[PDB]
Amino acid sequence: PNFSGNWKIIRSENFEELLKVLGVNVMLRKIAVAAASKPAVEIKQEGDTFYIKTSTTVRTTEINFKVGEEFEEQTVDGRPCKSLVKWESENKMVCEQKLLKGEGPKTSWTRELTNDGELIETMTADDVVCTKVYVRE
Amino acid sequence: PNFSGNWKIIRSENFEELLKVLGVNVMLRKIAVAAASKPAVEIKQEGDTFYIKTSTTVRTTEINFKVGEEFEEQTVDGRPCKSLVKWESENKMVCEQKLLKGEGPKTSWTRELTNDGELIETMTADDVVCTKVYVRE
Numbered sequence: 001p002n003f004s005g006n007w008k009i010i011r012s013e014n015f016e017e018l019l020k021v022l023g024v025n026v027m028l029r030k031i032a033v034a035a036a037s038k039p040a041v042e043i044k045q046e047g048d049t050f051y052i053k054t055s056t057t058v059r060t061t062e063i064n065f066k067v068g069e070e071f072e073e074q075t076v077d078g079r080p081c082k083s084l085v086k087w088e089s090e091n092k093m094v095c096e097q098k099l100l101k102g103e104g105p106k107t108s109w110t111r112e113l114t115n116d117g118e119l120i121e122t123m124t125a126d127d128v129v130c131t132k133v134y135v136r137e
Numbered sequence: 138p139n140f141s142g143n144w145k146i147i148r149s150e151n152f153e154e155l156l157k158v159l160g161v162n163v164m165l166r167k168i169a170v171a172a173a174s175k176p177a178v179e180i181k182q183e184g185d186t187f188y189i190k191t192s193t194t195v196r197t198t199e200i201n202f203k204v205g206e207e208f209e210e211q212t213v214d215g216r217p218c219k220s221l222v223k224w225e226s227e228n229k230m231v232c233e234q235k236l237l238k239g240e241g242p243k244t245s246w247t248r249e250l251t252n253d254g255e256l257i258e259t260m261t262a263d264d265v266v267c268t269k270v271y272v273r274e
Contacts, residue, residue: 011164014171017194021175112163120167128194131171133164 001091003050003111007041007119007134014130021128022077022105041119041134050085067093075099075107076123138228140187140248144178144256144271155260155267159214159242172196178256178271187222204230209237212244213260213267 016033024032031037036057044051048067053060065071067085075081081097088094092112105125112120119134152173156166174194181188185204190197202208207221218234225231229249246260256271 011168013168014174014195017174021194114163118164120164122167122171128174129171131167133168 001113003043003045003113003119005043005119005136007043008137009038009040009132009134010118011131011133013132014128015132018076018123018125018128018130022125024077039132041121043119072100073097075104076109076125079104081107138250140180140182140250140256142180143274144180145274146176146269146271147255149176149267149269151265151267152269155262155265156214158265159212159244159262161214176269177274178258210234212236212241213246213262216241218244 012033016029019029019032037059039054039056042053042055049064050066051062051064053062055061061074063071063073065083065085067087070082070084073081073083075097079102080100082100083095083097085093085095088110091114092110095109097107097109107123107125109121109123114120117136119136121132121134123130153166153170156169157163161169172193172195177192179188179190179192186201187203188199188201190199198211200208200210202220202222204222204224207219210218210220212218212234216239217237219237220232220234222230222232225247228251229247231247232245234244234246242262244260244262246258249257251257254273256273258269258271260267
């Protein structure tokens, strides 16, 4: 169905720990998980075309993509990557990322909609997964 | 033989499927997947007495039991149960679980030490089996 909406975070699991295993220093981890860094996510979906803007109190980023068409974004640790999203099913998109320069962990993400209209986001780096869950405002 | 040691995972199958057949909703499964990252198992075996600590990037749980003596733990989906472990062979133990309160699917688990020195852990609910294989660190 339809991912469009203004989404507010209600659960976050394993995010700081994932940053830790990627080598992010403790000062940056602590700020990444601070109240002031809680992400709001605004999505506008038109068929396979998506605009997703993710904002905290200090940062704002937007991606625009169509399912099945390569685009550029950043990995969960700021390295530029080429991304490609596919539908795993009607309510779930999966994204494979490839670094533009150099080598690093294999990263990906998924976003999916539940029965009850929660948005679940997961991000994976090698063997480590973090999960965020949002509800619509 | 001796189950003692610190065990690192080399493969895993059907974790989320097990939770799914137990009726855990998809939100909770995806949180559980994040909280299950990089599982490590520390075992201290002294004859028939066992201490088993399971650590992931987010959480640590510990059970202490003696083979043939009932103890309390939780099912894989987090429900309190009484458990009783028995030897099924020289190198394999099997645990049957019964809920403290209420009724539910039959759940069990096993742990086996192979001839190649691997530890195989299985957890069963209905006819779904989740399997993890570890080697000694």
